[PDB]
């Protein structure tokens, strides 16, 4: 009833509300029921308001000092707009505890979505929870007590971050896959390739939760991206003096990969060579074209392809592509080592190196003939079993580049 006592008590009640959470955090390392804290919060507000009315009535010459005192205690312990450190302790705690338990609930809701393998629900929650973690963690900063701020982060926040982080690959590939689809469906192949590149970058890192669905999504994006590409002739290159290699950017309908659809001209002249046969890669996108006519060393040839179609539908554009035929010039030949392994069939071509005059190794475009102390099979295999030496001679046919007779040890 007396004013001094009323204000004395209302201040005690305001602090009591802060003790409601702070004491239990400190004593037990736990949080109170938030509802007890709300109850204490409301008692303090009512204690405040009642104390004000009593002071307005019977405070006399201390009226203003009383209201300021009350206000100061209120603003520190219970509530204040835009709190600084140590202010609005109860209201900041409530907000942070509520922020933190919403995190926990969202985390648990996310876990349910991955447990139920629901990609769309997990995607939504990942974004919502990401937003909470980034934009609203400042709520935690306004809490009074390093000890209790740390209790909020460890208790609730750390788990939520961990679930979110763990899912980033899953959500990225789902997003990029559909961005890819949407890009091709929108006639934008640069956008689709770039989206697809990301897919490919991350899909080997998705978790188990949605792996099949996500791998499926990624395969659908790849395939849908290929479809939009135009089948192209990429290149031609000589092989020997009567054949050349053609490369496709996309497997070719083998029924269109026939001689009549290939034209070969000695470039800049009217001399035209006839295709004999076309032999396609089951591998899809490369064929060997064999000519009746012979290619001249050092000449350039233009290959005009027409009438080719895809492994499924689309037409290659008539295309012009050249290659130049060069028959290498063997200058030297040597055996790679002073020895051969002990085996019943050693291929001598694997043991010998041929170079041109500049000393560059000539990998193809020449024939090898051998003589040996040992019987030769297929012109190149020898049996070294039970032998400690053998004699061999590699000559590049039918030039005069040759090893001469060389005695090689047999040892592994």
Q: Map residue 344 onto helix, strand or coil.
A: coil
- Do 210 and 253 meet the contact criterion of CB atoms below 8 Å apart? no
- Do 393 and 406 meet the contact criterion of CB atoms below 8 Å apart? yes
The DSSP letter of residue 369 is E
The DSSP letter of residue 334 is E
The DSSP secondary structure of 250-302, one letter per residue, reads: S-B-TTT-SGGGEEEEETTSS-EEPEEEEEE-TTSSEEEEEESSPPPTT-EEE
Task: Identify the helix (H) or strand (E) that includes residue 392.
Answer: strand 389-397
Q: How many CB atoms lie within 10 A of CB 272?
A: 11
Contacts of 387 by beta carbon, 8 Å cutoff, 6+ apart: 342, 374, 410
Contacts of 375 by beta carbon, 8 Å cutoff, 6+ apart: 382, 383
| Whole-angstrom distance, CA of residue 186 vs CA of residue 157 | 41
* CA nearest neighbour of 10 among 55, 64, 70: 70
Task: Identify the helix (H) or strand (E) that includes residue 324.
Answer: strand 319-324
C-alpha distance from residue 242 to each of 260, 365, 390 (Å)? 17, 12, 37
Q: Map residue 343 onto helix, strand or coil.
A: coil
| Residue 26 and residue 84 in one domain | yes
* CA nearest neighbour of 92 among 16, 17, 9: 17
| Whole-angstrom distance, CA of residue 8 vs CA of residue 3 | 8
The DSSP secondary structure of 111-176, one letter per residue, reads: HHHHHTT-HHHHHHHHHHHHHHHHHSTHHHHTSS-HHHHHHHIIIIIHHHHHHHHHTHHHHHHHHH
- Counted residue by residue, the chain has a size of 412
Q: Map residue 412 onto helix, strand or coil.
A: coil
Burial of residue 17 (CB within 10 Å: 0-12, 13-18, 19+) is buried
Q: Which of 144, 166, 188 is the last residue of a domain?
A: 166
Angular region, 301: left φ>0, alpha ψ -120 to 50, beta rest: beta
Tokens of 283: 């591998």
Q: How many CB atoms lie within 10 A of CB 39?
A: 14
Q: What CATH code is carried by the domain that includes residue 47?
A: 1.20.58.790
* CA nearest neighbour of 23 among 153, 140, 145: 145
Q: Map residue 200 onto helix, strand or coil.
A: helix
Specify the experimental method. X-ray
* CA nearest neighbour of 72 among 14, 26, 140: 14
Q: What CATH code is carried by the domain that includes residue 266?
A: 2.60.40.1220
* CA nearest neighbour of 229 among 284, 189, 265: 189
List, in sequence order, every residue forming a beta bridge with 355; answer none if it has no partner.
Answer: 332, 361
| Residue 144 and residue 188 in one domain | no
Q: Map residue 84 onto helix, strand or coil.
A: coil
Tokens of 306: 């027409």
Rounded to 5 degrees, what are φ and ψ at 173? -70, -35
| Whole-angstrom distance, CA of residue 88 vs CA of residue 84 | 8
Q: What CATH code is carried by the domain that includes residue 157?
A: 1.20.58.780
- Do 343 and 292 meet the contact criterion of CB atoms below 8 Å apart? no
Half-sphere exposure in the Cβ direction for 339 (13 Å, CA): 9
Total domain count for the chain?
5
| Whole-angstrom distance, CA of residue 327 vs CA of residue 350 | 21
C-alpha distance from residue 99 to each of 127, 140, 157 (Å)? 16, 8, 9
Half-sphere exposure in the Cβ direction for 323 (13 Å, CA): 24
Max Cα separation, the chain?
A: 130
| Residue 150 and residue 106 in one domain | yes
Residue with tokens 């000890």: 147
| Residue 153 and residue 191 in one domain | no
The DSSP secondary structure of 9-44, one letter per residue, reads: HHHHHHHHHHHHHHHHHHHHSSPPPHHHHHHHHHHH
| Residue 104 and residue 70 in one domain | no
| Residue 306 and residue 357 in one domain | no
Q: What CATH code is carried by the domain that includes residue 352?
A: 2.60.40.2120
Helices 89-115/3-28 angle, 10° precision: 30
Q: Which of 326, 356, 373 is the last residue of a domain?
A: 326
* CA nearest neighbour of 142 among 81, 96, 74, 76: 96
Burial of residue 61 (CB within 10 Å: 0-12, 13-18, 19+) is exposed
Resolution reading in Å: 2.4
Q: Which of 326, 355, 371 is the last residue of a domain?
A: 326
Rounded to 5 degrees, what are φ and ψ at 148? -85, -35
| Whole-angstrom distance, CA of residue 364 vs CA of residue 237 | 13
| Residue 145 and residue 181 in one domain | no
| Whole-angstrom distance, CA of residue 130 vs CA of residue 137 | 11
Tokens of 342: 């002990």
Rg (CA), the chain: 42
Q: What CATH code is carried by the domain that includes residue 195?
A: 1.20.58.770
The DSSP letter of residue 327 is -
| Whole-angstrom distance, CA of residue 133 vs CA of residue 168 | 14
| Residue 52 and residue 30 in one domain | yes
Q: How many CB atoms lie within 10 A of CB 62?
A: 13
The DSSP letter of residue 317 is P
The DSSP secondary structure of 217-249, one letter per residue, reads: HHHHHHHHHHHHSPP-EEEEEEEETTEEEEEES
List, in sequence order, every residue forming a beta bridge with 158; answer none if it has no partner.
Answer: none
List, in sequence order, every residue forming a beta bridge with 288; answer none if it has no partner.
Answer: 245, 279
| Residue 314 and residue 256 in one domain | yes
| Residue 157 and residue 185 in one domain | no
Tokens of 296: 């001249």
Supply the range of the domain harboring residue 192.
167-229
| Residue 274 and residue 213 in one domain | no
| Residue 2 and residue 63 in one domain | yes
């Amino acid at each position: 009833t007396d004013v001094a006592t009323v204000v004395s008590q209302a201040k005690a009640q305001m602090k009591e509300a802060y003790y409601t959470y702070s004491h239990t955090v400190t004593e037990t390392g736990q949080f109170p029921d938030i509802k007890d804290v709300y109850a204490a919060y409301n008692k303090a507000k009512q204690a405040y308001a009642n104390a004000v009315a009593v002071v307005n009535k019977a405070g006399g010459a201390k009226k203003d000092a009383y209201l300021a005192d009350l206000q100061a205690i209120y603003e520190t312990y219970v509530f204040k707009a835009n709190p600084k450190s140590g202010e609005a302790r109860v209201a900041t705690y409530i907000d942070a505890y509520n922020y933190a338990t919403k995190l926990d609930k969202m985390r648990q809701e996310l876990k349910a979505a991955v447990d139920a393998k629901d990609l769309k629900k997990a995607e939504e929650l990942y974004h919502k929870i990401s937003y909470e973690l980034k934009t609203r963690t400042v709520i935690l900063d306004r809490v009074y007590g390093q000890s209790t701020r740390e209790l909020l982060r460890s208790t609730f926040k750390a788990d939520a971050q961990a679930l979110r982080d763990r899912l980033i690959y899953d959500i990225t590939v789902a997003m990029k896959a559909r961005e890819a689809q949407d890009a091709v469906k929108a006639g934008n192949l640069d956008k689709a390739k770039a989206a697809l590149d990301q897919v490919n970058q991350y899909v080997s890192k998705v978790t188990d939760a949605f792996k099949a669905e996500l791998q499926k999504a990624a395969q659908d994006a790849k395939a849908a991206y290929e479809a939009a590409l135009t089948p192209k002739v990429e290149s031609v290159s000589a092989i020997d003096s009567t054949s050349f290699k053609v490369t496709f950017t996309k497997p070719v309908d083998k029924a269109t990969a026939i001689p009549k659809n290939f034209s070969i001209t000695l470039k800049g002249t009217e001399t035209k060579l006839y295709p004999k046969s076309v032999e396609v890669s089951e591998s899809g996108l490369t064929a060997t074209v064999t000519l009746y006519d012979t290619l001249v060393d050092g000449k350039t040839y233009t290959v005009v392809t027409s009438g080719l179609k895809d492994t499924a539908g689309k037409e290659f554009e008539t295309s012009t592509n050249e290659f130049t035929y060069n028959k290498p010039v063997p200058a030297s030949i040597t055996f790679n080592f002073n020895k051969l392994p002990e085996d019943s069939a050693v291929d001598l071509t694997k043991y010998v190196t041929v170079k041109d005059a500049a000393g560059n190794v000539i990998k193809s475009g020449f024939e090898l003939e051998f003589t040996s102390s040992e019987k030769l099979t297929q012109g190149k295999f020898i049996n070294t079993t039970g032998k400690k030496s053998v004699i061999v001679n590699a000559t590049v046919k039918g030039t005069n580049v040759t090893t001469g007779n060389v005695i090689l040890a047999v040892e592994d």
